[PDB]
Design a protein around this nucleic acid. Structure first.
Length: 201
DNA sequence: GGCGTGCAGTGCCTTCGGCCGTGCGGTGCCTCCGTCACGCC
């Protein structure tokens, strides 16, 4: 059914990772942010509840929002909309999974919660950059960080998606036809993510 | 005069050290094809 009254109130560290390659257009990237913010207003943001991070990843990653930013939610969504279209020739899934592993989850800020890397991808990084890919995926598995591949478009690295799935059982993936189908699964996605978090005592 | 190796990594272990390995860009499924500088014999 369609979600009518949804407001994820659980203990969750949620990280948004946005493919910055030219595989997506300006507007197609604008829709991606639409999907993001639309999902943000469905979450209880608080340092004691649902924390969120936002990262655009090209050949290198720019973090618009950190988990500990401790700003106001109404602006956290503001930032997410002002995310610039990079259209780079390279969106390194390895590098960003690296960044997430060593930068975001270097320390465990809150053991009691669940961590989720929402990998919104639509491209294939150069093959030579995939060297230590599994390494990063597994490194996250050990730090108890779920990874959720979102396959947008015909160029979404199918191999890496399945490769990620294999690593961890709770590494379910969503394979979409385009940025269009993104909205059509807002409920099913947001639900899965939220329902994977522990509701506080 | 052909070869056969190259080397990333907050790598790894027995570390004042050595070994495992996508040498490298770039295409478009994939972990690879098709390349080029280097030494060595």
């Amino acid at each position: 059914p369609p979600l009518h009254d949804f407001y994820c109130s659980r203990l969750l560290d949620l990280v948004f990772l946005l493919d910055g390659s030219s595989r997506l257009s300006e507007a197609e990237f604008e829709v991606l942010k639409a999907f993001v913010v639309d999902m943000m207003e469905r979450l209880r943001i608080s340092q004691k509840w649902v924390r969120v991070a936002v990262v655009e990843y090209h050949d290198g990653s720019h973090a618009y929002i950190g988990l500990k930013d401790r700003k106001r939610p109404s602006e956290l969504r503001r930032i997410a909309s002002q995310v610039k279209y990079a259209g780079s020739q390279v969106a390194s899934t390895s590098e960003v999974l690296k960044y997430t592993l060593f930068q975001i989850f270097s320390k465990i800020d809150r053991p009691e919660a669940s961590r989720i890397a929402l990998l919104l991808m639509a491209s294939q990084e150069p093959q030579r950059m995939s060297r230590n890919f599994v390494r990063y995926v597994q490194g996250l598995k050990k730090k108890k960080v779920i990874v959720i591949p979102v396959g947008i478009g015909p160029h979404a690295n199918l191999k890496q998606i399945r490769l990620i799935e294999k690593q961890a059982p709770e590494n379910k993936a969503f394979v979409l036809s385009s940025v269009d189908e993104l909205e059509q699964q807002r409920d099913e996605i947001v639900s899965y993510l939220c329902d994977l978090a522990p509701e506080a005592p």
